[PDB]
Scaffold this motif. Structure first.
Motif, PDB file in Angstrom:
ATOM      1  N   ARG A  68       0.760  -1.005  -0.187  1.00 42.35           N
ATOM      2  CA  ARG A  68       0.327   0.008   0.008  1.00 42.35           C
ATOM      3  C   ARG A  68       1.305   1.437  -0.350  1.00 42.35           C
ATOM      4  O   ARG A  68       0.610   1.913   0.925  1.00 42.35           O
ATOM      5  CB  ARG A  68      -0.720  -0.118   1.172  1.00 42.35           C
ATOM      6  CG  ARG A  68      -1.881  -0.769   1.077  1.00 42.35           C
ATOM      7  CD  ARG A  68      -2.730  -0.800   2.175  1.00 42.35           C
ATOM      8  NE  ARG A  68      -4.266  -2.089   1.969  1.00 42.35           N
ATOM      9  CZ  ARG A  68      -5.817  -1.456   2.668  1.00 42.35           C
ATOM     10  NH1 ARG A  68      -5.783  -0.761   2.903  1.00 42.35           N
ATOM     11  NH2 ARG A  68      -6.277  -2.612   2.697  1.00 42.35           N
ATOM     12  N   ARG A  69       1.583   1.348  -0.590  1.00 41.73           N
ATOM     13  CA  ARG A  69       2.539   2.765  -0.890  1.00 41.73           C
ATOM     14  C   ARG A  69       3.086   2.670  -2.171  1.00 41.73           C
ATOM     15  O   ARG A  69       2.673   2.295  -3.241  1.00 41.73           O
ATOM     16  CB  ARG A  69       4.375   2.633  -0.612  1.00 41.73           C
ATOM     17  CG  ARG A  69       3.796   2.447   1.329  1.00 41.73           C
ATOM     18  CD  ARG A  69       5.428   2.371   1.627  1.00 41.73           C
ATOM     19  NE  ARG A  69       5.014   2.095   3.324  1.00 41.73           N
ATOM     20  CZ  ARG A  69       6.469   1.972   4.279  1.00 41.73           C
ATOM     21  NH1 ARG A  69       7.492   1.479   3.288  1.00 41.73           N
ATOM     22  NH2 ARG A  69       6.704   1.878   4.835  1.00 41.73           N
ATOM     23  N   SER A  70       3.388   3.929  -2.495  1.00 45.58           N
ATOM     24  CA  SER A  70       4.336   4.632  -3.779  1.00 45.58           C
ATOM     25  C   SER A  70       5.161   5.828  -3.772  1.00 45.58           C
ATOM     26  O   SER A  70       5.244   5.482  -2.557  1.00 45.58           O
ATOM     27  CB  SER A  70       3.026   5.592  -4.636  1.00 45.58           C
ATOM     28  OG  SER A  70       3.338   6.246  -5.928  1.00 45.58           O
ATOM     29  N   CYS A  71       5.964   5.419  -4.976  1.00 49.58           N
ATOM     30  CA  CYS A  71       7.309   6.686  -4.561  1.00 49.58           C
ATOM     31  C   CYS A  71       7.095   7.476  -5.989  1.00 49.58           C
ATOM     32  O   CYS A  71       7.281   6.767  -7.070  1.00 49.58           O
ATOM     33  CB  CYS A  71       8.077   5.813  -4.541  1.00 49.58           C
ATOM     34  SG  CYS A  71       9.254   4.709  -6.055  1.00 49.58           S
ATOM     35  N   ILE A  72       7.874   8.474  -5.604  1.00 52.16           N
ATOM     36  CA  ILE A  72       8.619   9.105  -6.961  1.00 52.16           C
ATOM     37  C   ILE A  72      10.198   9.106  -7.361  1.00 52.16           C
ATOM     38  O   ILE A  72      10.467   9.701  -6.347  1.00 52.16           O
ATOM     39  CB  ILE A  72       8.493  10.392  -6.902  1.00 52.16           C
ATOM     40  CG1 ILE A  72       6.659  10.233  -6.725  1.00 52.16           C
ATOM     41  CG2 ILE A  72       8.717  11.659  -7.776  1.00 52.16           C
ATOM     42  CD1 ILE A  72       6.591  12.797  -6.392  1.00 52.16           C
ATOM     43  N   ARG A  73      10.796   8.634  -8.103  1.00 53.65           N
ATOM     44  CA  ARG A  73      11.585   8.275  -8.590  1.00 53.65           C
ATOM     45  C   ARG A  73      12.454   9.129  -9.620  1.00 53.65           C
ATOM     46  O   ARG A  73      11.626   9.101 -11.024  1.00 53.65           O
ATOM     47  CB  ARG A  73      11.941   6.467  -9.443  1.00 53.65           C
ATOM     48  CG  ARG A  73      11.655   5.887 -10.015  1.00 53.65           C
ATOM     49  CD  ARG A  73      11.955   4.793 -10.179  1.00 53.65           C
ATOM     50  NE  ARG A  73      11.936   4.230 -11.525  1.00 53.65           N
ATOM     51  CZ  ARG A  73      12.662   3.930 -12.237  1.00 53.65           C
ATOM     52  NH1 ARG A  73      14.233   4.592 -11.962  1.00 53.65           N
ATOM     53  NH2 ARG A  73      12.500   3.595 -13.684  1.00 53.65           N
ATOM     54  N   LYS A 103      -3.840   5.584   2.186  1.00 50.06           N
ATOM     55  CA  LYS A 103      -5.003   5.010   2.625  1.00 50.06           C
ATOM     56  C   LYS A 103      -5.947   4.917   2.207  1.00 50.06           C
ATOM     57  O   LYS A 103      -7.003   5.836   0.929  1.00 50.06           O
ATOM     58  CB  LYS A 103      -5.304   6.699   3.888  1.00 50.06           C
ATOM     59  CG  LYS A 103      -6.019   5.746   5.064  1.00 50.06           C
ATOM     60  CD  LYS A 103      -6.308   7.024   5.790  1.00 50.06           C
ATOM     61  CE  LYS A 103      -7.051   6.585   7.405  1.00 50.06           C
ATOM     62  NZ  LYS A 103      -7.756   7.768   7.927  1.00 50.06           N
ATOM     63  N   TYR A 104      -6.769   3.846   1.966  1.00 52.55           N
ATOM     64  CA  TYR A 104      -7.915   3.132   1.366  1.00 52.55           C
ATOM     65  C   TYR A 104      -8.681   2.970   1.638  1.00 52.55           C
ATOM     66  O   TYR A 104      -9.113   1.961   3.626  1.00 52.55           O
ATOM     67  CB  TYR A 104      -7.162   1.717   0.385  1.00 52.55           C
ATOM     68  CG  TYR A 104      -5.923   1.521  -0.526  1.00 52.55           C
ATOM     69  CD1 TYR A 104      -6.523   2.436  -1.691  1.00 52.55           C
ATOM     70  CD2 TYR A 104      -4.744   1.533   0.325  1.00 52.55           C
ATOM     71  CE1 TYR A 104      -5.424   2.472  -2.602  1.00 52.55           C
ATOM     72  CE2 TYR A 104      -4.209   1.218  -0.620  1.00 52.55           C
ATOM     73  CZ  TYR A 104      -4.290   1.450  -2.204  1.00 52.55           C
ATOM     74  OH  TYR A 104      -2.717   1.403  -2.805  1.00 52.55           O
TER      75      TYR A 104
END
Length: 134
Positions: A68-73, A103-104
């Motif tokens: 449940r995560r995201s990132c900017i790379r 957050k879902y």
């Protein structure tokens, strides 16, 4: 705002949060993904990179993107892309500028709990769909 999910992004000067409100089983059934939600979150975190450059100007770090995560790379050509770990396993990515957990979510609900059961014809039409095939 979509027909199935309501994705929101609250960006402050220090912390950025992504939320997703849906009235269903959220990540498909348990921890999977639909493509449209991933593309929408990728578009949103692509636009907030261009619009909020100074907030995201942080030190590039290596970290494991968890459930449940995201990132900017950063890519190899100094182009900023976004990958969301909607996969079951943690994803190892480099040149990460920011990690955002998503957050879902999930008296109107007290009436929606009963009015769905007021229409019991899904199983009736399922029997009819099994019936016609002869």
């Amino acid at each position: 705002m979509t027909r199935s999910c309501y994705v929101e992004l609250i960006a402050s000067d220090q912390d950025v949060a992504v939320s997703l409100r849906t009235p269903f089983e959220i990540l498909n059934e348990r921890e999977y993904l639909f493509d449209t939600y991933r593309e929408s979150i990728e578009k949103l975190l692509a636009e907030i990179m261009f619009d909020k450059v100074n907030i995201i100007n942080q030190t590039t770090t290596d970290c494991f993107l968890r459930t449940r995560r995201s990132c900017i790379r950063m890519t190899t050509d100094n182009k900023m892309i976004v990958k969301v770990n909607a996969t079951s396993r943690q994803i190892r990515l480099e040149n990460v500028k920011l990690v955002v957990k998503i957050k879902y979510e999930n008296t109107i609900k007290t009436i929606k709990n009963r009015l769905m059961t007021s229409l019991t014809f899904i199983e009736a039409f399922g029997n009819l769909s099994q019936q016609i095939k002869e």
